[PDB]
Amino acid sequence: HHHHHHMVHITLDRNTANSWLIISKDRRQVRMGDTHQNVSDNKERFSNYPMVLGAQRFSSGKMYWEVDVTQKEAWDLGVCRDSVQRKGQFSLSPENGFWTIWLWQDSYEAGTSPQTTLHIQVPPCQIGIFVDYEAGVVSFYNITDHGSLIYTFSECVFAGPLRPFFNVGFNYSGGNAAPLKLCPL
Ligand SMILES: CN(C)C(=O)c1ccc2c(c1)CCCN2
């Protein structure tokens, strides 16, 4: 792909974070803490899952960013509507305002309803995310495998401003403590 030139500097929004997340001083890394992180509750925080949004809102144009997923067993990445549900249980689907992929139990899947099996020969250590607002496209790229395409959502009905979306995953196993990191431009 040749999307790198639409690179945007993403930072994480602390106020949207689940209360167990630890966001770095530079707002470019997030990981699961082993306890509540001593913050007040608010209506923006994702309650049920270890999720956080980027601060940036996009309503037009082309945007690209990259995320490091090294040594994680589980995570979700993509974009979502600014107005997505924060409290209670929900599925990651375009009907609910999410355009995402994930790793879970040694398989990669796109967040369609129902979910779609992905075919990845080289397990990615860094993921590229491309959004074309006007075209209604969200695409995912395997940076470890020379930028190979992972998945394209097309005919997207965004229906609002978009925000970068992150889920560091549960760490029941003790094998998923590593952070998500926004990679340098
Ligand atoms: C309990 N452990 C070890 C987890 O991995 C975990 C999973 C989900 C979740 C939380 C923790 C607190 C935030 C809300 N959801």
Swiss-Prot record:
Induction: Up-regulated by IFN.
Taxonomic superkingdom: Eukaryota
Domain B30.2/SPRY: 8-185
Keyword Calcium set for record: no
Gene Ontology BP terms: negative regulation of innate immune response; negative regulation of NF-kappaB transcription factor activity; negative regulation of protein deubiquitination; positive regulation of autophagy; positive regulation of cell cycle; positive regulation of protein binding; protein autoubiquitination; protein destabilization
GO cellular component, one term: cytoplasmic stress granule
Keywords associated with the record: Cell cycle, Coiled coil, Cytoplasm, Cytoplasmic vesicle, DNA-binding, Metal-binding, Nucleus, Ribonucleoprotein, RNA-binding, Transferase, Ubl conjugation, Ubl conjugation pathway, Zinc, Zinc-finger
Similarity annotation: Belongs to the TRIM/RBCC family.
Name of this chain's protein: E3 ubiquitin-protein ligase TRIM21
Organism, as annotated: Mus musculus
Lineage summary: Eukaryota, Metazoa, Chordata, Craniata, Vertebrata
First-to-last residue of the parent protein present: 291 to 468 of 470
